Amino acid sequence: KPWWEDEWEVPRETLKLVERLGAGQFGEVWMGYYNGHTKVAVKSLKQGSMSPDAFLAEANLMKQLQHQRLVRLYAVVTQEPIYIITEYMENGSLVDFLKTPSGIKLTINKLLDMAAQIAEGMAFIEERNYIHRDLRAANILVSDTLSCKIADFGLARLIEDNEYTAREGAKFPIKWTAPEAINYGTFTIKSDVWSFGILLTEIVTHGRIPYPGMTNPEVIQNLERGYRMVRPDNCPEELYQLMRLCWKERPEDRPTFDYLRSVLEDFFTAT
C-alpha cells in the first residue's frame, strides 16, 4: 500500500527518541516513546549509507511475519530520515544478556527454555516459507520477562521454491553459516537449522565465540574431515547430540524447527 494507506506509517511527531543504543555505518538505534507512553525501538537510516529501498524491505518482510516469538514491526516513517520502529526488548541481545550478572546466574533449565523459545519462533518462519540467514545469539532479543524473540530480518527471504541463492560476491559469517551456503551460496531453512545448532553453543557457553581457538580456515578444514565443534564446557550431552543433528552433512537430514522445539521443551520440562 502507499504510505497514506499503509497501516504501519506514522507521523514522525508521534515519536520521541530518548536514548541512543547504538550507532553504525548505516544509521542508529534508539530507545524512544510513541505518543509519549509506549516504549519502542527506533532504527534510523543514515542517508546515503545504503539504499532506502533496501532498508525498508526489512520492514515490508516483517509485516508478513507476525508472531509472539518474533520482534514485531511497530511502525515506519518513510520520509527521510527513514525510521523502522519495532517492539522494544528490555534486555537487549541474547549474546549480551547471557554475560550480565543476571544472565550468568541462569540455570541450564532456563537456558533450555530460551533455546526452545527460539526454535518456536524459527518454526513459525519455517512454516511460512521464509528463511532468516542470520540466525545467531546476537540476533535474538530478550524481554524484561526473559522471553526470547527472533530479530534482525535484514537477510530474511521468502522462499518460492526450496532455495535462495546469494550473489557470488556475497560473504557470510563462516562459523555460523551452513557449508552449502558457504560453498554454493545456497540457503534453505535447513541452513538456518545448522546456524541454530551453532546458536545453541552460544547459549550454553554464555555467549562464547563458536569453535574456540580456531580460525575460519581451520573450521572449514575440520568440517570437511567430518569433524564438528568440540563439546563445549559443561554442555549436557543430550543438548550436544541435538546440535549434532543440526550439523548433519546433507541439509535434508537435518531436523525441522518444530522437531527441535518439541525436543527442547521436553529437555526443559525434564530438567
Residue found by looking up cell 547471557 in the block: 98
Distances in Å between the Cα of 141 and the Cα atoms of 114, 129, 245 are: 11, 22, 25
For residue 15, give the nearest of 85, 81, 89 by alpha carbon.
85
Beta bridge partners of 32: 17, 40
Technique used to solve these coordinates = X-ray
d(CA 241, CA 155): 28
| One domain for residues 142 and 102 | yes
CA angle 152, 89, 264 (to 5 degrees): 75
| One domain for residues 83 and 95 | no
| One domain for residues 34 and 114 | no
Three-state SS for 3-37 is CCCCCCECCHHHEEEEEEEEEECCEEEEEEEECCC
| One domain for residues 80 and 94 | no
- Whether residue 141 is annotated as binding a ligand: the answer is no
| One domain for residues 83 and 170 | no
- Whether residue 207 is annotated as binding a ligand: the answer is no
- Whether residue 92 is annotated as binding a ligand: the answer is no
Domain end, chosen from 40, 67, 88, is at 88
CATH number at residue 32: 3.30.200.20
Q: Which residues contact 44 (CB under 8 A, 6 or more apart)?
A: 27, 28, 29, 30, 81, 82, 83
For residue 86, give the nearest of 68, 59, 64, 65 by alpha carbon.
59
Give the distance from CA 15 to its chain's centroid: 26
Question: How many structural domains does the chain have?
Answer: 2
**Would you say 142 and 87 are in contact if contact means Cβ atoms under 8 Å apart?**
no
- Whether residue 29 is annotated as binding a ligand: the answer is yes
| One domain for residues 152 and 262 | yes
Q: Is 109 left (phi over 0), alpha (psi -120 to 50) or beta?
A: alpha
- Whether residue 13 is annotated as binding a ligand: the answer is no
| One domain for residues 219 and 126 | yes
| One domain for residues 212 and 141 | yes
d(CA 136, CA 129): 19
| One domain for residues 71 and 140 | no
Domain that holds residue 135: 89-270
| One domain for residues 10 and 122 | no
d(CA 52, CA 7): 19
Catalytic residue list = 134
**Would you say 31 and 89 are in contact if contact means Cβ atoms under 8 Å apart?**
no
Domain end, chosen from 50, 66, 88, is at 88
Domain end, chosen from 30, 61, 88, is at 88
Omega cis (within 30) before 81: yes
The DSSP result for 204-246, as a single string, is HTTSPPSSTT--HHHHHHHHHTT--PPPPTT--HHHHHHHHHH
Give the distance from CA 125 to its chain's centroid: 11
Give the distance from CA 255 to its chain's centroid: 18
Cell of 77: 516513517
| One domain for residues 141 and 8 | no
CATH number at residue 194: 1.10.510.10
d(CA 88, CA 37): 13
